[PDB]
């Protein structure tokens, strides 16, 4: 998800 | 005063951020919970006291002061549970300013994280490392070590 | 030395206890998670590093070493991520003994708590406060304060 | 439950 806690 | 902490509860995004402040250093620990309950508060204090030498906690409101579960965790962990009356009215403004600073930090990181709990831990990290010069993380370790010695 | 930590993962009651050990003092932090994933590990390390000055983490296995999510957290929090190869075979024994000690404590408290997470935090508390005379909690504060000065 | 985390 392009987030540090959800790279996807 | 090296063992004295203050609880503080603030809201964001429909959730509750519970915060423990080490009063002499300004160092904090914090967690996100769906609602503030005596069980959640009690567990948070049991975590804090296994990590730092917590002698006294000033509770954030009357419900957590009253709560028999919070008192049971304070008994278990060897903590003196106290009220949080700002007999020094300066305490009241220091907490408000801290909550405003934490929320500002949380907005500056909010978009690097999917979940609020990540943004809250990034805000703890930034707050505790900020040099104001020493950081709160430096002050708390210096204070307690001086006490041990 | 003051900034070096070791991850460690052990199982009980079909759940996973994830542990970080401050190598030079033996102090620990721990949490209960349903399974070890890179995302759980990464969040745990973000929490640890906002509380103590974490310079290096020796990961507990190759999957957490490999995990891009764990590397992303170590980047965010300024942590050098390393492998956990016991080049000193003494490390293997210390970890195993620590795990056996924590499980023993957890059994001695297990019936004071409904949930395993409470028992694990009671065991963190007992381990960090135990005088062996200084405690691990005293040692980690002394070591870091010495390093700050 | 007569437990520290569940006094009931
Ligand atoms: Cl609430
Ligand atoms: Cl697993």
* Candidates 3.20.20.70, 2.40.50.140, 3.40.1160.10, 3.30.420.10; CATH matching C1-149: 3.30.420.10
Distance CA C3, CA B72 (A): 35
> Domain locations in chain C?
1-149
Distance CA C61, CA C85 (A): 9
Strand ranges across the sheet with B80-82: B27-33, B15-22, B4-12, B56-58, B80-82
Distance CA C97, CA C141 (A): 23
CA B138 to chain centre: 17
A 1-8 → C contacts, CB under 8 A = 4-7
D6 and B72 in contact by Cβ < 8 A?
no
Distance CA D1, CA D8 (A): 4
Nearby residues for ligand 2 (ion, Cβ within 5 Å): C 35-36
Tokens 């569940």 -> residue:
D6
Q: Which residues contact B88 (CB under 8 A, 6 or more apart)?
A: none
C76 and A5 in contact by Cβ < 8 A?
no
Collect all residues of chain A within an 8 Å Cβ-Cβ radius of residue B113: 3-5
Residue of C nearest to B143 (CA): C145
B141 and C145 in contact by Cβ < 8 A?
yes
SS3 percent helix, strand, coil of chain A, rounded to 5, is 0, 25, 75
- What are chain C's partners, defined as 3 or more CB pairs within 8 angstroms? A, B, D
The resolution in Å comes to 1.9
Strand ranges across the sheet with C56-58: C28-33, C15-22, C4-12, C56-58, C80-82
Distance CA C58, CA B74 (A): 34
C113 and D4 in contact by Cβ < 8 A?
yes
- Look up residue B35 and give its two tokens: 């609602």
CB B28 within 8 A of CB B120: no
Annotation: binding site of C for Mg(2+): 8, 60, 96
Residue of C nearest to A7 (CA): C69
**Helix H or strand E encompassing C80:** strand C80-82
How is residue D7 annotated by DSSP? -
User: Phi then psi for B95, rounded to 5 degrees?
Assistant: -60, -50
Collect all residues of chain A within an 8 Å Cβ-Cβ radius of residue B114: 1, 3, 5-6
Structure determined by:
X-ray
Residue of B nearest to A8 (CA): B114
Neighbouring C-alpha atoms within 13 Å toward the C-beta of B144: 26
| Residue B60 in marked binding region | yes
User: Phi then psi for B28, rounded to 5 degrees?
Assistant: -130, 155
Q: Identify which of B85, C94, C117, B88 has the alpha carbon closest to the alpha carbon of residue D5.
A: C117
CA B36 to chain centre: 14
**Helix H or strand E encompassing C6:** strand C4-12
Distance C132 CA to ligand 2 centre (A): 32
């Amino acid at each position: 998800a392009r987030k540090i806690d959800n790279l996807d | 005063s090296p063992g004295i902490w203050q609880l503080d509860c603030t809201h964001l995004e429909g959730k509750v951020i519970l915060v423990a402040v080490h009063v002499a250093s300004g160092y904090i620990e914090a967690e996100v919970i769906p609602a503030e309950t005596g069980q959640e508060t009690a567990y948070f204090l049991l975590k804090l006291a296994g990590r730092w030498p917590v002698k006294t906690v000033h509770t954030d409101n009357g419900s957590n002061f009253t709560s028999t579960t919070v008192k049971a965790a304070c008994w278990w962990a060897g903590i003196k549970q106290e009220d949080g009356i700002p007999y020094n009215p300066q305490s009241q403004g220091v907490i408000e300013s801290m909550n405003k600073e934490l929320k500002k930090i949380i907005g500056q990181v909010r978009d690097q994280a999917e979940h609020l709990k990540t943004a809250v831990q990034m805000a703890v990290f930034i707050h505790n490392h900020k040099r104001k010069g020493y950081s709160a993380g430096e002050r708390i370790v210096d204070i307690i070590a001086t006490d041990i010695q």
